[PDB]
Design a protein around this ligand. Structure first.
Ligand SMILES: Nc1ccn([C@@H]2O[C@H](CO)[C@@H](O)[C@H]2OP(=O)(O)O)c(=O)n1
Length: 124
């Protein structure tokens, strides 16, 4: 199996690079992280910060989650992220993405003990 917390790291953490390196980035990473195995995951954000920095977000600004739950938190500082969005030529199993680097606040849902990120909700 895989815990919620490990799945979050798998799907959203990329501390080895500080920015969306190339135009190839999303195509390479979505595949690599197994996010295009059952279908082409539509949108997925990678965070280029240390894991400790991202976990710290669970003690930052408490905001409502898009689903109405209240266990979402917004980072006080902007972070380096790469946004991956599915293109048109993208036809499963040949998923195609547009790589987009940006610096924004991230909003994650947290839970458990230790209280850690389990879902990426939004970037603002
Ligand atoms: N800016 C966004 C919005 C959504 N997602 C991911 O796409 C899913 C569908 O919105 C979200 O739940 C989240 O993945 P996950 O919940 O698995 O962290 C993301 O990575 N980045």
């Amino acid at each position: 199996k895989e815990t919620a917390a490990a799945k979050f790291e798998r799907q959203h953490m990329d501390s080895s690079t500080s920015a969306a390196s190339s135009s190839n980035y999303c195509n390479q990473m979505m595949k690599s992280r197994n996010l295009t195995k059952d279908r082409c995951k539509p949108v997925n954000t990678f965070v280029h910060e240390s894991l400790a920095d991202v976990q710290a977000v669970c003690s930052q600004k408490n905001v409502a989650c898009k689903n109405g739950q209240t266990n979402c938190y917004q980072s006080y500082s902007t972070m380096s992220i790469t946004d991956c969005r599915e293109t048109g030529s993208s036809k499963y199993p040949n998923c195609a993405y547009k790589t987009t680097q940006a610096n924004k606040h991230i909003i994650v849902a947290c839970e458990g003990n230790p209280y850690v990120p389990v879902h990426f909700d939004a970037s603002v």
